[PDB]
Antibody, heavy 216, light 218 residues
Framework: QESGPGLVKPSETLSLTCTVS????????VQWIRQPPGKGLEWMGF???????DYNSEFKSRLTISRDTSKNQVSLKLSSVTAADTAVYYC?????????????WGQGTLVTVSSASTKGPSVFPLAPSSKSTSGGTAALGCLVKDYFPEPVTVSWNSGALTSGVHTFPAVLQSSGLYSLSSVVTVPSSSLGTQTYICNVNHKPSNTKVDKKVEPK | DIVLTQSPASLAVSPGERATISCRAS??????????MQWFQQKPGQPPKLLIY???NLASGVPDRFSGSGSGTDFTLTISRVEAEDVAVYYC?????????FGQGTKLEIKRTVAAPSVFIFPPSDEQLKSGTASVVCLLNNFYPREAKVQWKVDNALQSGNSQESVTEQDSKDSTYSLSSTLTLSKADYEKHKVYACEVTHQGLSSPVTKSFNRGEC
């Protein structure tokens, strides 16, 4: 379930799963740490060798951390969720390797506690024109609109185009739905020869939208 | 629970120069002659990364420009020669007591020369208009400093309440910011008017820059 964001209705139980490689390693343990939006970091608990566990007393009422040696997996279960549990959850793998302690925090999973339903995005082109040009440089992009919940990841040409890409932070609109734009600057010469496709990933809705952006 | 208090809250450092971040603890983080203080770096949009553990031990793959010092209740992270890639929030952590606790973070900004924005305007797509909503986008690209004013004018009437701005964090390579201003109108209100204009005011600009289009042509 790690790097698979989504929704967990209020009063329900969040279950997150992480795949770990190092039950074999020395000093090995998995910590669960969360970061609410716009905020800092909060340690929740750990599972060590032999499934021994330790928990922060703020969540000991509703938190169980477990491991499955069969599937090389560790799980977090947080019962009676509220909007305060909306946060990026990190499965932190730690231990000793080579001559140094290490921590691998993974990608993080944004969990949104909402009674609202998931909605995939509407993707529209920000098309290049004479009004999107500066000295041989043209700007183009994609407007990613009306999605819930966060997050959306945007790539260009399936990761081949990275230089000049700016993906803006999402804005929550009046409607309760999010919107963002991803832009890229390219040579104006490339507009007739190179194909530009925005790859928009909305894992909460199980939706991926590819939009070809064509010159005006 | 041990409380960790970082200073400064925010700082701006020129590339090549030194950054000094301190972390104070409510109680000693020393046990068995070991100072259980860690330092982490959270770059824009990325998970936290361990930089230093046990006050002074560098993690694998951390540049030598990062150094940790201190003991007991007073600790310091020093970046000897700041690079543009160092834009991040830096956090102290104590593992001496359970639960482990973190500081509230210190925001490192990279000081650079003034750069005026490149301004671009995007009319709404016909596909979106069919849905009854028009989103007009103006892009301010690669500028410094962060402060900028974007005003929308529709048929020469300044707009209020119908625009939202989004700003990127400083770029890891050029230390600039980019900003989007999105004007959202009903299809009817969009079709009622002709000239859509984005006026930009920034320190790098001697006079405001206007980007404009007439509804109907390109």
């Amino acid at each position: 379930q790690e790097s698979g964001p989504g929704l967990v209705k209020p009063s329900e139980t969040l279950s997150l799963t992480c795949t770990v490689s190092g039950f074999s390693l020395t000093s090995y343990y998995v910590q669960w740490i969360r970061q609410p939006p716009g905020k800092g970091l909060e340690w929740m608990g750990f599972i060590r060798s032999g499934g021994n566990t330790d928990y922060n007393s703020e969540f000991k009422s509703r938190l169980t951390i477990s491991r499955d040696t069969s599937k090389n997996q560790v799980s977090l279960k947080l019962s009676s969720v509220t909007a305060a549990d909306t946060a990026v959850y990190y499965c932190v793998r730690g231990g000793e390797y080579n001559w140094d302690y290490f921590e691998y925090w993974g990608q993080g999973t944004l969990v949104t506690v909402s009674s609202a339903s998931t909605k995939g995005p509407s993707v529209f082109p920000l098309a290049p024109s004479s009004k999107s040009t500066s000295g041989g440089t043209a700007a183009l992009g994609c407007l990613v609109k009306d999605y819930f919940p966060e997050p959306v990841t945007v790539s260009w040409n399936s990761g081949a185009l990275t230089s000049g890409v700016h993906t803006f932070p999402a804005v929550l609109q009046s409607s309760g739905l999010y919107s963002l734009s991803s832009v890229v600057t390219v040579p104006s010469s490339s507009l007739g020869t190179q194909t530009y496709i925005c790859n928009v990933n909305h894992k909460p809705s199980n939706t991926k939208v590819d939009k070809k952006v064509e010159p005006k | 629970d041990i409380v960790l208090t970082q200073s400064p809250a925010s700082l701006a450092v020129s590339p090549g120069e030194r950054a000094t971040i301190s972390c104070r603890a409510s109680q000693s983080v020393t046990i068995f002659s070991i100072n259980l203080m860690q330092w982490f770096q959270q770059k824009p949009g990325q998970p936290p990364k361990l930089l230093i553990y046990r006050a002074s031990n560098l993690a694998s793959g951390v540049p030598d420009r990062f150094s940790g010092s201190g003991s007991g209740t007073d600790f310091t992270l020093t970046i000897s020669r700041v690079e543009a890639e160092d834009v991040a929030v830096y956090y102290c952590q104590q593992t001496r007591e359970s639960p482990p606790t973190f500081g509230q973070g210190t925001k490192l900004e990279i000081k650079r020369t003034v750069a005026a924005p490149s301004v671009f305007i995007f009319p709404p797509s016909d596909e979106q208009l069919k849905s009854g909503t028009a989103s007009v986008v103006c892009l301010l690209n690669n500028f410094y400093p962060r402060e900028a004013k974007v005003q929308w004018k529709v048929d020469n009437a300044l707009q209020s309440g119908n625009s939202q701005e989004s700003v990127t964090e400083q770029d890891s390579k050029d230390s600039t910011y980019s900003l989007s201003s999105t004007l959202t109108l009903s299809k009817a209100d969009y079709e009622k008017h002709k000239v859509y204009a984005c006026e930009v005011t920034h320190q790098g600009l001697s006079s405001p820059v206007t980007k404009s289009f007439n509804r109907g042509e390109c």
